[PDB]
Design a binder for this molecule. Structure first.
Ligand code: NI
Ligand code: NI
Ligand code: NI
Ligand code: NI
Lengths: 139, 139
């Protein structure tokens, strides 16, 4: 099992936060953030255009496709809902909530997600102030 | 990301239930159960003796080593504690609790585990009647 658990999902989540921040999704940005090497990020980003999860502009700009984005949103929603659960009901040290969520977000289901929304008190923001996207797709 | 999420952990969990049942941990048993092919189970079981997680007797019998076992126990404890959480606090359909746990057990931490025991009402049995092993190692 990979350390990122799910490479493809981690690149897509990253491109998303980078966007959320205002930054331009650039390989170099995914390389540092994910601490991924260069020809690592390259063949992986080069692997995403094959399945149509993104397009790299004639400026190395990373543009998720209507699907990549939908999936990034999915990964981002689980992640922040996981943090919400690890904080609100389990009580895991806030200093570990993230790393733990970085891991769960790749194995959580849509069903458990729908059940969390219903079981959780606040689903608009994560324990870190960020809004939780894609809840509309849930239901 | 692999479908088993964590191959090595899934073989070890399997050898464990097989033991729990009375069966002899045999490759063929891991092959059907895990639905893994043959030269798949072979090079993987053949990969476990390299890291010392098991020994294959002159009868193809699979004997976890003091460490393999400790890890199998760890995987089995998270699995059944996950089911307990997915049933007791989240309310996920019992018909999905397992598959979901089959997935989480490879990303759950010891810390979240320790917090579950404390947050969960019954930690002696899983939602399926099985006892939860290794709780002593937890704390
Ligand atoms: Ni986070
Ligand atoms: Ni992650
Ligand atoms: Ni189970
Ligand atoms: Ni599993």
């Amino acid at each position: 099992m990979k350390d990122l658990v799910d490479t493809t999902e981690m690149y897509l989540r990253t491109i998303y936060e980078l966007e959320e921040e205002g930054v331009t999704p650039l390989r170099a940005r995914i390389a540092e953030r994910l601490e991924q090497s260069g020809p690592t990020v390259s063949q992986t980003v080069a692997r995403m255009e094959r399945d149509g999860l993104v397009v790299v502009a004639s400026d190395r700009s990373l543009q998720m496709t209507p699907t990549g984005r939908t999936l990034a949103t999915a990964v981002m929603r689980k992640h922040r809902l996981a943090e919400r659960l690890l904080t609100d009901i389990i009580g895991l040290d806030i200093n570990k909530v993230h790393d733990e969520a970085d891991r769960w977000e790749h194995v959580m289901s849509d069903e458990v997600e729908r059940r969390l929304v219903k079981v959780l008190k606040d689903v608009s923001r994560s324990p870190f102030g960020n809004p939780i996207p894609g809840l509309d797709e849930l239901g």
